[PDB]
Paper text:
The novel oxidoreductase identified in our work showed to catalyze the conversion 2,7-anhydro-Neu5Ac to Neu5Ac in the presence of NAD+ in a reversible manner. The protein shows a Rossman fold typical of NAD-binding protein of the Gfo/Idh/MocA class characterized by a central β-sheet with helices on either side. Here, we showed that [name] acts through a multistep mechanism involving a keto intermediate and cycling of NADH/NAD+.
[name] forms a dimer in the asymmetric unit, and the NAD+ cofactor can be seen bound to the protein. In the [name] structure, there is additional density adjacent to the nicotinamide ring that, given the high resolution of the second structure, we were able to unambiguously identify as citric acid from the crystallization buffer. Oxidoreductase proteins typically have a catalytic triad of K (found in the EKP motif), D, and H (often found as a DXXXH motif; in some enzymes Y replaces the H) and a fourth residue, which is positively charged. The closest structural match (0.8 Å over 341 residues) is the recently solved crystal structure of YjhC oxidoreductase from E. coli, which also has a HXXH motif. The following mutants of [name] were constructed: K93A, K163A, H175A, H176A, and H178A. The purified mutants lost enzymatic activity, as demonstrated by electrospray ionization spray MS (ESI-MS), supporting the hypothesis that they are catalytically important.
Residue numbers in the entry:
A (entry chain A): -1 to 205, 209 to 372
B (entry chain B): 1 to 205, 209 to 369
Write the structure that this text describes.
């Protein structure tokens, strides 16, 4: 029984890109043909035992490149996805898809028009506890979802070098760089809100031009709401998603790692990740890095925690399945139709606008009933 | 020790109990009460007179001070007439259901030279007082952010209480204004700009909003988030205070205070003893499925934690009315600053929500 090989290029072979390469390489029917990275491409090509390309059009033009993993910095996703689509190459793109809805919409439409595949790297949807939460919600356990509350709040000391992840024009700041929590809320509420308000600023880090506190206030259709908090100036650390419905509530805690279901007077626990060891390992890490959350951000030469390494495996395996003709499940459909890429960058843009312009923003002000 | 004669206007759950308390303080007598419904009953218990007209009641020689504990909508008439007749005033939260109403009440009492104490009882919680001591000493550094919540689940009762009618209670924002007052005290004033969202999500048929989310912008790059309501199946009741060097949590569901500074973590009591804190926690656990039973009625009794701060407060008030100097700590409960700041910001939030836009507090002060 043959089983067809797909040739993968990797564009951007830093912390996350290098590791997606290590992972895809060892999946069934998958080969790393070549990578592109001006800084770290020679190094990671020696490790993966593949070629080095320096031009996108040359790279995509190769017969042996049928698919590309895009993991450049957040601001540099546009050019690699558009050229792969132009050369008939299927695409996986890291979060955040882009730093503007214009950019994200052009990327999804180009890939649709050239009939290639576009998978959005919204990796939180592969977390065991997120999947369990969706199963419980769809089964009607907590009833209709009324309210989601996210937070991703820690304290970051000012480092010796300022990373690109810390520059707003390159990272898009906390809202874009940690968009997982916005995407998560949007998935659980079944789409975008009608209207957002975001406040915050740089409260403690004025000396890294990023906002260090952000507070979002979302109004959804048919009387539902959400509140989302981010940043790097909170001396009381918090990282969770809370889901409150007509019959019950669910908490996915990522600081004290565990899931909680509340129904009647009853209270069940469930795993966020693949095993009690992964959950407990996460909890140890957050305890260790309470005084300085800055050490938690990846660099070329560092390695992801267990919980993250495992969902990267789940995700690279799901992607490889798709590219071998596997049917997509309703559960992950929105990572390919483009609905989730668009919904996350739309709402992010809407929030960014709200804050810089000091006013409430309708999501129509970013969509416009486009196509 | 001189005797002060107190009238009580409104002798339901809270008013009756403030009377029981003041009665047994040094230099304090309950001369008479007024309550169409429950006045005859509570006058038999307190062994005092019954009046049916405010002007007649205040006109008595023997009435030098009034405790006002009518429903939230009915504070205006009793405070203005007491001021007109030279009578000193204590008024229950929320002072009024409009800034116009609250401003008129503070100015009338100032103009007639009588005393006006705002019943912002959360400021007498041991853990609130401790939090202020820590903040002012510089332990957590500059306060950047406050996060309050008061979120539980209320089942729909057989009869609709006035506390559940928006026109009469002013809804969660006014009826549970303690948390807004608390944040305003810790941030040292009102915000520059507010946004409030929410609605009736689960209770359509009790016209109150059952979820409210406030987003406050303060001067010099500071913020707060405040949550309220009666449609949350994950109960939460706390105030969290995050600064440049540390953070403090006052938890009222899992009752205890927490200080975080460097890698250190200290516990402190919210209330007067570990028994009061634990008693609170038991109650919140007991009433998780229906927080509606926690709201007072004529004939019912406040928890230990609440009974005790009512004692702290009635004693502080009685001290003031015996010529005791006010401490900087409670000054704003008499100057009118706290009554005005709480109803201004509440009005601003209410406006924001019904009009679907951000509201500057200049739009209420100016
Ligand atoms: N899904 C997740 O959980 C997760 C976690 C971390 C990072 N990420 C995402 O991964 C992507 C990369 O982030 P990272 O953590 O690897 O950062 P990083 O600094 O570790 O990696 C960036 C790499 O891109 C290279 N690069 C720079 N310019 C390039 C160009 N023009 N073409 C190709 N490569 C170029 C850099 O030299 C570096 O090797 C981002 O989209 C980021 O948001 C995702
Ligand atoms: N500070 C606190 O912790 C706290 C707690 C509960 C209530 N309160 C406040 O106490 C006040 C009353 O609340 P409650 O719990 O006692 O409500 P309640 O229903 O228990 O008592 C209200 C009483 O006012 C009487 N009343 C009605 N109209 C009147 C009028 N025109 N003149 C005089 N009395 C009149 C009613 O008959 C009733 O006896 C409100 O301001 C409320 O917000 C404060």
């Amino acid at each position: 029984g043959a089983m067809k090989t797909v040739g993968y290029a990797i564009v951007g072979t830093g912390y996350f890109g290098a590791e997606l390469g290590r992972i895809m390489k060892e999946q069934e029917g998958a080969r790393i043909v070549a990578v592109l990275d001006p800084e770290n491409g020679q190094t990671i090509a020696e490790e993966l035992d593949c070629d080095v390309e320096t031009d996108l059009d040359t790279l995509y033009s190769r017969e042996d490149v049928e698919a590309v993993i895009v993991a450049t910095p957040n601001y540099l996703h546009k050019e690699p996805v558009i050229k792969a689509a132009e050369h008939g190459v299927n695409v996986f793109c890291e979060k955040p898809i882009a730093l503007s809805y214009q950019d994200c919409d052009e990327m999804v439409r180009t890939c649709q028009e050239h009939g290639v595949i576009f998978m959005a790297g919204h990796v939180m949807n592969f977390f065991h506890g997120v999947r369990y939460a969706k199963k419980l919600i769809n089964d009607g356990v907590i009833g209709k979802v009324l309210y989601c509350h996210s937070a991703r709040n820690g304290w970051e000391e000012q480092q010796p070098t300022i990373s690109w992840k810390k520059i707003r024009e390159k990272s898009g700041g906390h809202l874009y760089h940690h968009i997982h929590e916005l995407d998560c809320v949007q998935f659980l509420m079944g789409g975008m809100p009608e209207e957002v308000t975001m406040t915050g600023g740089n409260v403690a880090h004025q000396g890294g031009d990023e906002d260090d506190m952000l507070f979002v206030n979302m109004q959804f259709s048919d009387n539902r709401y959400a509140v989302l908090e981010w940043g790097s100036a909170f001396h009381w650390p918090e990282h969770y998603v809370l889901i409150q419905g007509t019959k019950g509530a669910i908490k996915i805690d990522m600081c004290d790692c565990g899931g909680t279901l509340k129904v009647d007077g009853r209270e069940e626990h469930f795993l966020v990740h693949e095993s009690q060891e992964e959950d407990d390992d996460r909890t140890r890490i957050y305890h260790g890095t309470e005084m300085d959350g800055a050490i938690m951000y990846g660099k070329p030469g560092k390695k992801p925690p267990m919980w993250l390494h495992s969902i990267m495996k789940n995700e690279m395996k799901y992607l490889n399945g798709i590219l071998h003709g596997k049917e997509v499940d309703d559960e992950f459909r929105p990572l390919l139709t483009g609905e989730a890429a668009r919904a996350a960058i739309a709402t992010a843009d809407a929030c960014t606008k709200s804050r810089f312009e000091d006013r409430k923003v309708k999501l129509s002000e970013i969509i416009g009933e486009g196509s």
